[PDB]
């Protein structure tokens, strides 16, 4: 029970910290998101990289 | 032959090739920014033009230098305006005096007609200044120029149409401004002295020339030559012609209106027009293309001036302040880019001052808003166009996860809520219930949480998962693929869209085909499941499909807006995805939920504006944002979740990700034929670099690729704002603008000023919140161009100020012209275009006669112009001399223009269309109009000669396609002569399996048999036959033909030209001769009747005698309203008796409401006010969730055919052959979906149950709000003998409203004036039509079960969605 | 401990949902802190990959350590900061400099180079110096709405508006009295003892030779 | 109290999955 | 009846994952 009390007091603190931090977060966009998604989707469907994958190497995604 | 250069300007203005022409003539020009054009070798088809001797004599005594087109524009306009009167002998035909004569006669006729109909003599009086023959030639400054440019534009179209002969040219020599037209170019030639005009140098006089010649001593090139030249294209000339016609129409309408009223006419005065026209011309000439930056401000300035009219509140002037500051900011930029002294640029300041300082009423500002395109359009450069797009589509955004998260959760909540209120239960959830506690106990109890508590538990919607909705294998329309569209070429051959000589190398491969209609017929398989499979496997990501190209839009004033073009199969994927979205899921988002709040009932407003669930007052305020700037701001980080949720909702996978997966992999460029990318070479070609034209890694969206999804996301964010601020909002989306209205509640005892201030404060709170919410999504509302106002709104395509609709007539009536875009320059095409434009124009104003004059003028002009300058014949041909061997007289053309179109004449301006667009029976109204016109013309003995013409030779299918017409050769449209050719080409050049299965070998026999069978009942009913024919596979076949008609080399494919010429001569012979077409027996027989219904009945029986075979026709003839009811005036106030110059049972009663709610600017005109009334509001055991079009049409056919036949019959054997051709259901199951029946009178109740009606009068909608119509006093017709009569009680309301509106259109009202009258029923036209059934003695004997393979026609599993 | 357990359960579910959404949105290519800092320090511009910041201000302060040079990320953050400054009493409120205000008043006046144009310049400058330009513009618009023209509006504002009580007219340097605009020549007068604006004296023209003329409207 | 245990196990499952997703990033 | 032993077990796992999230937040988020 005491171990449960200590674990609960740690968990609540962590949870409150995460929510308070999440209220203030902000992100910026990049140009590697959609090509990376397309690459992963193609490997998921077929198991091989899409034809003429050099452009994906140019974006630094094919890996 | 079939296709000709466009009659009006519809394309962007591009002047690249002009640089190549100038280099091939030895002149200098710098139109283009592309360095490829400075040193390439000239394409041969342009280089060969320097050998023509006419062009060398035209360029005699000219300078080496040229000038741009706009620096001359001002002088061009002035020169044509003042010099066109000395060249009447060039256009001696077109007979201008006869045009004026016919227009005057037509106004007199309409005045007599309206005086007889309204029952009051002397309503319309004579201002002898507008009625004299010399009014328009002498007082309109654009008359002669307009005629000259009509003539010259026909010549220019002829010269461009020919494929280039080196001897085909035209020229015009004036006192100034010589012109010369060659294959694709027009050359303007002006004296040098008129440009310098006693100045130090050429750049000193025109500072805009410093862009071409920075600072150079130009006098060595101008001393020895008397003229200077500017080279331009054919589109520049067409734009000039368009500008003259628009300005002439606008000036004439305004001048006549101001002579008509002279106190208040809803048109700007002529002083303002003259000033704006001159100053705009000067602004364009001095600043060239940039000038359009200043001129682009006319529309927002007009709107901002309209807004300053209600109860004063400081905020009402902020928008005007912002626009003025923007206008001067622009000016300051232009003045430093060209180093212009302050004393030189007075025209721009005069332009802004002329707009602001004229203190017009809101109506005149709303009309002045329509002159935006009266100065032309700018020249476009693709690098300047794509700089903005590149900067906006590659920029980085700062996003906040919390806003994105919450708007996604709101998206899911909206979908779920619409599902629950549609089907009364939760969809089948599949997620663990423990994750969402709040939603669990609403799901278990099958209840939906209230609007107040959604915000507190918003996060819980992230975990909800469920079963798929909206099955994919059915879409409603399936005719969206056939439609015309522009596509790009495959990536192996992407250079092929450019010129070989400009490129500098020959591309190894050349492309096979491009347009949609020609490539849909070429695809051999085309399943719909195969498109789905194409998307599921991500086949497009193959290297062959990675091409994308832009193209610019036609008629705007900005630096250039682009629409995109995709390869063919990616275009199929896009069309399928958008159609799927628009049918299934876009229905849960109301994007047009708005109605004007001042026009809505108080109980409805109170119910809608209450947050939870009377002593309350509701006041609204709106603001306007621009949706055009949304497309480029969307990023994947934002839209991943919405796309994935759509994928789950449809069960498919990877379907809605196509744009974000594909676009960043393409090479973005403009497919301009003469402007390749700056830096592409032969070895560079496979992986070209970035330059000014082109770039890699487009990261945003494009203008129309995913419109449905973006609008849905916008609605979700607006709803999130509604949850946050706890205020009710109503949004509407027009084509470009979206207007949002905030509703606020006040106590009864509140001062009006306080309410006005507080409503705007609440609207501003909402606007700030929305600005933040979209800013954290990467989309930036620009507060500088946004205004908050209490009265101004866009609702339809119209503008409202405090609920009072404002006129917008010039927008549609200024484009009236002699020609339209038709086949082989058809006369009916032109006249029909004029007629439709006229009816809309009258719907948008309160002045009738000024627009009528223009319509009649252009009708007679069209006749003369096409008579002696037809493009389909040799240069001088004189159709009338070939046809009748002598020239036509004025009376013959007049009589042709009087005869209604249903009778084989050329009248498309029916006066009855001033009242309502949908006319029940066109034949009876046409006979009424013809009788009135002949009584006015004093030739009353020609009636029975003109209506009794020889019937032609028509089959049953022609009569089924045209139910309400006659068997006269002259009334038939021209497309019916080409349809047979189109079908033949379809059976030659098609490999598509769907098309080959639909147009199988024996379709003609099916058409013949079905049409013959539908007219075999003992009493024939043509409306029923037409309704049935539209739903058989023959109707689908006709629809596909209609889609495919508007094409090239399909319709086109010597002897085709000769066939068309012979058809044209035959049609003219039938139109302009009435002694040739006569049946003396028919005239002798018709001569006895006096009612118009008997005449119509006899004509219909006699004309289709061969088809009818002695049986009698029913269900077609209905009386004309203007003959059935007469206007009797009961009470008129004392102030109106002086203005109308007058000195002193079953009926509908009409009166005028004395109480006024709003008014702008005063109460002196009836169309300036609104009231309280609303007279238009007064006038299934099973249902499938997703019914296909085939099932809907099958249900409609079963309903109609069951309702027509008798109960004691053997209906089933008649129903099986029709139903087996559409769906797979048996007979009995179908009956489970029919609604309630067993009440009606077949002849009478067919027209009102299944007809197509007009829901309102063709007037501005302010009058209906003050009309008190009461249809309780017309005796036994208020269902005793009422279900069994001719009267249609929905159209009498339109007639009453229209009479009240038209009678008082110019009277000067006061607070003490009132009006009440009544419509009296007449006995001649009323008939008692007994209830009667149709008896079919034989079922259809043809195998219609042959389309089991077509999903376009057949539904193999008709009911796979929920039975519900 | 039912309450202290159920509260933790609901919040844990909420935190889970929010951070799952976050990781899915930027996943599989986001730049960690060390790589972001290394790339930015060595190249001078941030990587082309998405990144996560603690606050908007941290994004506003992301620059190379060696030198402070603006980069696309900072511009995006600054743009967003101006959006956050908005308030609902001043949404789309016009902000006008003295020159801009004079141009607007000129737009409302008829003619050219009349005495009222000079009056408009003087009033706009004086109002902008005292920080009362918005109230001045609102009073002008109100007088316009009552149904009068701009000239009567300007005269009434000269009499009554608070910012002009007891203010000496400014002094304008000219070569002579032929330099003054032609339409304003007829209105020149002799300098009164104690000229002031609220009594109808606009400005004082001082020639090169010490001769002073006072403009009266 | 059984409902509490079931909810906790579900939360742990989701947490495990989202930790795997985050492990992918770093 | 098994839920009792299983919470007693699973709260430790939840604490470990939570500790892991505090660890990962310090490397992912830029806070200079
Ligand atoms: Zn009659």
Curated annotation (Swiss-Prot), chain A:
**Annotated localization:** Virion; Host cytoplasm
Stretch forming the signal peptide: none
Give the superkingdom in one word. Viruses
Subunit organization: Homooligomer. Homomultimerization via the coiled coil domain is a prerequisite for binding to L. Found in a trimeric complex in which VP35 bridges L and the nucleoprotein. Interacts with NP. Disrupts innate immune signaling in infected host cell.
The record's similarity note reads: Belongs to the filoviridae polymerase cofactor VP35 family.
- Role according to the record: Plays an essential role in viral RNA synthesis and also a role in suppressing innate immune signaling.
Query: What name goes with this protein?
Result: Polymerase cofactor VP35
Protein source organism: Lake Victoria marburgvirus (strain Musoke-80) (MARV)
- Mapped onto the parent protein, the portion here is 110 to 172 of 329
UniProtKB/Swiss-Prot annotation, chain B:
| Main subcellular location of this protein, as a coarse class | host cell
Q: Could you tell me which residue ranges the RdRp catalytic domain spans? A: 619-803
**What superkingdom heads the lineage?**
Viruses
Its localization reads: Host cytoplasm; Virion
Signal peptide residues are: none
Any one GO MF annotation of this record:
ATP binding
Catalyzed reaction equations:
RNA(n) + a ribonucleoside 5'-triphosphate = RNA(n+1) + diphosphate; a 5'-end (5'-triphosphoguanosine)-adenylyl-adenylyl-cytidylyl-adenosine in mRNA + 2 S-adenosyl-L-methionine = a 5'-end (N(7)-methyl 5'-triphosphoguanosine)-(2'-O-methyladenylyl)-adenylyl-cytidylyl-adenosine in mRNA + 2 S-adenosyl-L-homocysteine + H(+); a 5'-end (5'-triphosphoguanosine)-adenylyl-adenylyl-cytidylyl-adenosine in mRNA + S-adenosyl-L-methionine = a 5'-end (5'-triphosphoguanosine)-(2'-O-methyladenylyl)-adenylyl-cytidylyl-adenosine in mRNA + S-adenosyl-L-homocysteine + H(+); a 5'-end triphospho-adenylyl-adenylyl-cytidylyl-adenosine in mRNA + GDP + H(+) = a 5'-end (5'-triphosphoguanosine)-adenylyl-adenylyl-cytidylyl-adenosine in mRNA + diphosphate
Enzyme Commission number: 2.7.7.48, 3.6.1.-, 2.7.7.88, 2.1.1.375
GO cellular component, as recorded: host cell cytoplasm; viral nucleocapsid
| UniProt KW keywords | ATP-binding, Host cytoplasm, Hydrolase, Methyltransferase, mRNA capping, mRNA processing, Multifunctional enzyme, Nucleotide-binding, Nucleotidyltransferase, RNA-directed RNA polymerase, S-adenosyl-L-methionine, Transferase, Viral RNA replication, Virion
In Gene Ontology terms, what is a biological process of this protein? negative stranded viral RNA transcription
Q: Where are the transmembrane segments?
A: none
Known role: RNA-directed RNA polymerase that catalyzes the transcription of viral mRNAs, their capping and polyadenylation. The template is composed of the viral RNA tightly encapsidated by the nucleoprotein (N). The viral polymerase binds to the genomic RNA at the 3' leader promoter, and transcribes subsequently all viral mRNAs with a decreasing efficiency. The first gene is the most transcribed, and the last the least transcribed. The viral phosphoprotein acts as a processivity factor. Capping is concomitant with initiation of mRNA transcription. RNA-directed RNA polymerase that catalyzes the replication of viral genomic RNA. The template is composed of the viral RNA tightly encapsidated by the nucleoprotein (N). The replicase mode is dependent on intracellular N protein concentration. In this mode, the polymerase replicates the whole viral genome without recognizing transcriptional signals, and the replicated genome is not caped or polyadenylated.
Q: Kindly provide the name given to this protein in its UniProt entry.
A: RNA-directed RNA polymerase L
- State which gene encodes it: L
Included stretch of the parent chain? 4 to 1416 of 2331
């Amino acid at each position: 029970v005491l171990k449960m009390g200590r674990t609960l007091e740690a968990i609540s603190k962590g949870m409150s910290e995460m929510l308070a931090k999440y209220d203030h977060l902000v992100i910026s966009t990049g140009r590697t998101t959609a090509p990376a998604a397309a690459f992963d989707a193609y490997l998921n469907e077929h198991g091989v990289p899409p034809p003429q994958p050099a452009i994906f190497k140019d974006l630094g995604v094919a890996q | 032959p079939t296709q000709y250069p466009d009659a009006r300007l519809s394309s962007p203005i591009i002047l690249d090739q002009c640089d190549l022409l100038a280099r091939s003539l030895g002149l200098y020009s710098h139109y283009s920014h592309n360095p490829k054009l400075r040193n390439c070798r000239i394409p041969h088809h342009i280089y060969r033009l320097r050998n023509s001797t006419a062009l060398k004599t035209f360029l005699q005594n000219c300078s080496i230098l040229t000038v741009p087109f706009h620096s001359i524009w001002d002088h061009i306009l002035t020169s044509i305006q003042y010099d066109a009167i000395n060249h009447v002998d060039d256009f001696k035909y077109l007979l201008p005096s006869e045009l004026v004569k016919y227009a005057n006669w037509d106004n007199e006729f309409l005045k007599a007609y309206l005086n007889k109909i309204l029952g009051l003599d002397h309503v319309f009086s004579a201002s002898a200044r507008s009625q004299c023959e010399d009014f328009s030639p002498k007082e309109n400054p654009y008359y002669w120029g307009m005629l000259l440019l009509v003539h010259l534009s026909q010549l220019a179209r002829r010269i461009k149409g020919q494929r280039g002969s080196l001897r085909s040219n035209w020229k015009f020599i004036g006192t100034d401004l010589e012109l010369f037209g060659i294959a694709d170019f027009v050359i303007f030639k002006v004296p040098v002295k008129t440009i310098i005009r006693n100045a130090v140098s050429l750049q000193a006089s025109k500072p805009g020339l410093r862009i071409w010649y920075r600072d150079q001593n130009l006098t060595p090139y101008l001393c020895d030559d008397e003229f200077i030249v500017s080279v331009a294209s054919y589109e520049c000339f067409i734009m000039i012609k368009d500008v003259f016609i628009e300005r002439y129409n606008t000036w004439e309408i305004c001048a006549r209106a101001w002579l008509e009223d002279s106190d208040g006419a809803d048109y700007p005065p002529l002083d303002v027009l003259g000033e704006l026209y001159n100053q705009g011309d000067q602004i364009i000439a001095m600043y060239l293309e940039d000038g359009f930056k200043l001129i682009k401000h006319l529309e927002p300035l007009c709107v901002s001036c309209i807004q300053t009219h209600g109860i004063f509140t400081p905020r009402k002037y902020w928008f005007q302040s912002q626009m003025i500051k923007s206008y001067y900011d622009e000016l300051h930029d232009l003045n430093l880019k060209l180093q212009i002294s302050d004393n030189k640029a007075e025209c721009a300041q005069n332009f802004i001052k002329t707009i602001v300082q004229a203190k017009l009423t809101p109506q005149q500002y709303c009309e002045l808003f329509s002159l935006q395109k009266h100065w032309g359009h700018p020249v476009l450069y693709n690098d300047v166009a794509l700089d903005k797009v590149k900067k906006h589509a590659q920029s980085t955004k700062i996003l906040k996860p919390k806003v994105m998260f919450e708007t996604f959760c709101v998206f899911k909540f909206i979908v779920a809520k619409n599902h629950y209120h549609s089907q009364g239960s939760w969809y089948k959830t599949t997620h663990d219930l423990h994750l969402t506690p709040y939603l669990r106990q609403h799901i278990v109890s099958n209840s939906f949480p209230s609007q107040a508590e959604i915000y507190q538990h918003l996060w819980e919607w992230y975990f909800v998962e469920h079963e798929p909705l909206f099955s994919t294998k059915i879409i409603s329309d399936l005719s969206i693929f056939i439609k015309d569209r522009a596509t790009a070429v495959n990536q192996e051959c992407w250079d092929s869209v450019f010129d070989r000589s400009v490129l500098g190398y020959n591309p190894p491969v050349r492309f096979q085909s491009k347009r949609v209609p020609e490539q849909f017929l070429g695809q051999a398989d085309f399943s719909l499941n195969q498109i789905l499979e194409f998307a599921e496997k991500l086949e497009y990501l193959a290297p062959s499909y990675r091409n994308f190209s832009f193209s610019l839009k036609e008629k705007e004033l900005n630096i250039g807006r682009t629409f995109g073009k995709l390869p063919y199969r990616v275009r199929n994927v896009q069309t399928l995805a958008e159609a799927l979205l628009a049918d299934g899921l876009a229905k849960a988002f109301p994007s047009n939920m708005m109605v004007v709040t001042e026009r809505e009932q108080k109980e409805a407003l109170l119910h809608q504006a209450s947050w939870h669930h009377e002593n309350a007052i509701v006041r609204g305020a709106s603001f306007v944002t621009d949706l055009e700037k949304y497309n480029l701001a969307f990023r994947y980080e934002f839209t991943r979740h919405f796309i994935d949720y759509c994928n789950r909702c449809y069960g498919v996978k990877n379907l809605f990700d196509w744009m974000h997966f594909l676009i960043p992999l393409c090479y973005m460029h403009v497919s301009d034929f003469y402007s390749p990318p700056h830096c592409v070479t032969e070895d560079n070609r496979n992986n070209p670099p970035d330059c000014a034209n082109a770039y890699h890694y487009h990261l945003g969206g494009i203008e129309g690729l995913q419109q449905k999804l973006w609008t849905c996301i916008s609605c979700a964010q607006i709803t999130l704002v509604e949850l946050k601020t706890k205020l009710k909002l109503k949004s509407s989306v027009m084509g470009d603008n979206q207007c949002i209205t905030t509703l606020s509640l006040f106590p009864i005892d509140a001062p009006n000023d306080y309410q006005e201030n507080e409503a705007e404060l609440n609207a501003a709170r909402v606007a700030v919140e929305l600005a933040i919410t979209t800013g954290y999504s990467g989309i930036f509302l620009k507060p500088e161009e946004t205004f908050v106002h209490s009265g101004f709104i866009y609702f339809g395509k119209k503008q409202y100020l405090n609920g009072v609709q404002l006129p917008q007539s010039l927008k549609t009536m200024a484009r009236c012209g002699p020609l339209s875009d038709s086949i082989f320059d058809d006369l009916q095409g032109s006249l029909a275009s004029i007629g439709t434009s006229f009816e809309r124009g009258t719907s948008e104003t309160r002045h009738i006669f000024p627009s009528r004059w223009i319509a009649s003028f252009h009708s007679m002009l069209a006749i003369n112009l096409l008579n002696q300058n037809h493009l389909g014949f040799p240069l001088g041909f004189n159709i009338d001399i070939s046809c009748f061997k002598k020239p036509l007289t004025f009376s013959e053309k007049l009589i042709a223009l009087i005869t209604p179109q249903v009778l084989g004449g050329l009248s498309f301006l029916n006066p009855e269309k001033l009242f309502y667009r949908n006319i029940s029976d066109p034949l009876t109204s046409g006979l009424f109009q013809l009788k009135n016109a002949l009584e006015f013309l004093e030739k009353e003995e020609l009636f029975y000669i003109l209506i009794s013409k020889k019937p032609g030779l028509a089959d049953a299918s022609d009569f089924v396609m045209n139910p309400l017409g006659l068997n006269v050769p002259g009334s038939k449209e021209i497309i019916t002569f080409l349809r047979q050719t189109v079908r033949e080409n379809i059976t030659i050049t098609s490999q598509n399996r769907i098309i080959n299965s639909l147009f199988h070998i024996g379709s003609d026999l099916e058409d013949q048999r079905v049409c013959e069978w539908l007219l075999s009942s003992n009493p024939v009913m043509s409306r029923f036959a037409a309704d049935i024919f539209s739903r058989t596979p023959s109707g689908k076949r006709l629809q596909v033909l209609g889609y495919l008609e508007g094409t090239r080399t399909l319709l086109a494919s010597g002897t085709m030209l000769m066939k068309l010429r012979e058809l044209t001569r035959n049609r003219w012979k039938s139109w302009f001769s009435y002694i040739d077409a006569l049946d003396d027996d028919l005239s002798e027989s018709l001569e006895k009747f006096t009612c118009t219904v008997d005449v119509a009945n006899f004509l219909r029986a006699y004309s289709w005698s061969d088809v009818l075979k002695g049986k009698r026709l029913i269900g077609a003839t209905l009386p004309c309203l203007l003959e059935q009811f007469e206007v009797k005036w009961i009470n008129l106030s004392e102030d109106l008796r002086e203005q109308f110059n007058l000195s002193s049972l079953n009926y509908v009663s009409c009166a005028l409401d004395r109480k006024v709610v709003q008014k702008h600017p005063s109460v002196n005109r009836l169309a300036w006010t609104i009231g309280n009334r609303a007279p238009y509001i007064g006038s299934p055991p099973l249902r499938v969730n997703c019914p296909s079009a085939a099932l809907k049409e099958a249900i409609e056919m079963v309903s109609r055919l069951l309702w027509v036949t008798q109960g004691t019959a053997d209906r089933e054997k008649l129903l099986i052959p029709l139903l087996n051709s559409r769906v797979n259901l048996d007979y009995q199951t179908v009956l489970n979906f029919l609604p309630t029946h067993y009440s009606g009178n077949i002849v009478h109740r067919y027209n009102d149950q299944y007809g197509q009606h007009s829901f309102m009068a063709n007037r501005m909608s302010n009058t209906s709000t003050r009309a008190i119509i009461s249809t309780n006093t017309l005796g036994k017709y208020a269902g005793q003998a009422a279900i069994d009569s001719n009267i249609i009680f929905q159209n009498t309301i339109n007639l009453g409203v229209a009479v009240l509106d038209i009678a008082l259109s110019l009277a000067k009202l006061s607070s003490a004036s009132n009006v009440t009258f009544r419509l009296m029923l007449n006995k001649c036209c009323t008939r008692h039509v007994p209830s009667e059934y149709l008896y079919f003695d034989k079922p259809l004997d043809v195998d219609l079960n042959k389309y089991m393979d077509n999903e376009l026609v057949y539904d193999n599993d008709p009911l796979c969605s929920g039975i519900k």
